[PDB]
Curated annotation (Swiss-Prot):
The chain holds residues 44 to 165 of 1362 of the full protein. Chromatin reader protein that recognizes and binds acetylated histones and plays a key role in transmission of epigenetic memory across cell divisions and transcription regulation. Remains associated with acetylated chromatin throughout the entire cell cycle and provides epigenetic memory for postmitotic G1 gene transcription by preserving acetylated chromatin status and maintaining high-order chromatin structure. During interphase, plays a key role in regulating the transcription of signal-inducible genes by associating with the P-TEFb complex and recruiting it to promoters. Belongs to the BET family. It comes from the Eukaryota. This is Bromodomain-containing protein 4. JQ1, a thieno-triazolo-1,4-diazepine derivative, and I-BET, a benzodiazepine derivative, have been tested on tumors with success. Treatment with GSK1210151A (I-BET151, a I-BET derivative) has strong effets on mixed lineage leukemia and promotes myeloid differentiation and leukemia stem-cell depletion. Residues 17-123 form the Bromo domain. The record marks 99 as: Acetylated histone binding. Interacts with p53/TP53; the interaction is direct. Interacts (via CTD region) with CDK9 and CCNT1, acting as an associated component of P-TEFb complex. Interacts with RELA (when acetylated at 'Lys-310'). Interacts (via NET domain) with NSD3, CHD4, BICRA and ATAD5. The interaction with BICRA bridges BRD4 to the GBAF complex. Interacts (via NET domain) with JMJD6 (via JmjC and N-terminal domains); the interaction is stronger in presence of ssRNA and recruits JMJD6 on distal enhancers. Interacts with NSD3. Interacts with NIPBL. It is linked to Cornelia de Lange syndrome 6: A form of Cornelia de Lange syndrome, a clinically heterogeneous developmental disorder associated with malformations affecting multiple systems. It is characterized by facial dysmorphisms, abnormal hands and feet, growth delay, cognitive retardation, hirsutism, gastroesophageal dysfunction and cardiac, ophthalmologic and genitourinary anomalies. CDLS6 inheritance is autosomal dominant. Ubiquitously expressed.
Length: 124
């Protein structure tokens, strides 16, 4: 079908804090995943029109990507680190839901998820 609008990334009416955890999530976790060889499918929303996948947004009702997560962190959209961790987990899980066990794109998300969990292990 049409793509939906991307997820909201900025709400100037949401109260804002800096934490060590939110700082680590942007400066370490997002940055490390971004630069990974396997990041590029996850750096922007799924453009299902360009990809010719009419069923993508029939299956995926909670879309998420690292581009949105980067903007959410930069815009202090998250109050609790867990909100950001949940967006990363939504992104990975969306990939496992839409795709099939052993698919190249699933193995890519699995490796990103493993790196995620290694970085989250050291959340301050
Ligand atoms: C046909 C071209 O497709 C893409 C182009 C770009 C460009 C990368 C560089 N930037 C600057 C522009 C977009 C980024 C991503 C894609 N494709 C893409 N994005 C997300 C997903 C995706 N495909 N695919 C398809 C596949 C990918 C691979 C490696 C195997 S199968 C699946 C299904 C939607 C997926 O889950 N994701 C997140």
């Amino acid at each position: 079908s049409m793509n939906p609008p991307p997820p909201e990334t900025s709400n100037p009416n949401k109260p804002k804090r800096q934490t060590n955890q939110l700082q680590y999530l942007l400066r370490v976790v997002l940055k490390t995943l971004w630069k990974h060889q396997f990041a590029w499918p996850f750096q922007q929303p799924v453009d299902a029109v360009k990809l010719n996948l009419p069923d993508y947004y029939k299956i995926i009702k909670t879309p998420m990507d690292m581009g949105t997560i980067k903007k959410r962190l930069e815009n202090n959209y998250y109050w609790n680190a867990q909100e950001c961790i949940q967006d990363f987990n939504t992104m990975f899980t969306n990939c496992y839901i839409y795709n099939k066990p052993g698919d190249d794109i699933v193995l890519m998300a699995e490796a990103l998820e493993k790196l995620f969990l290694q970085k989250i292990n050291e959340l301050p």
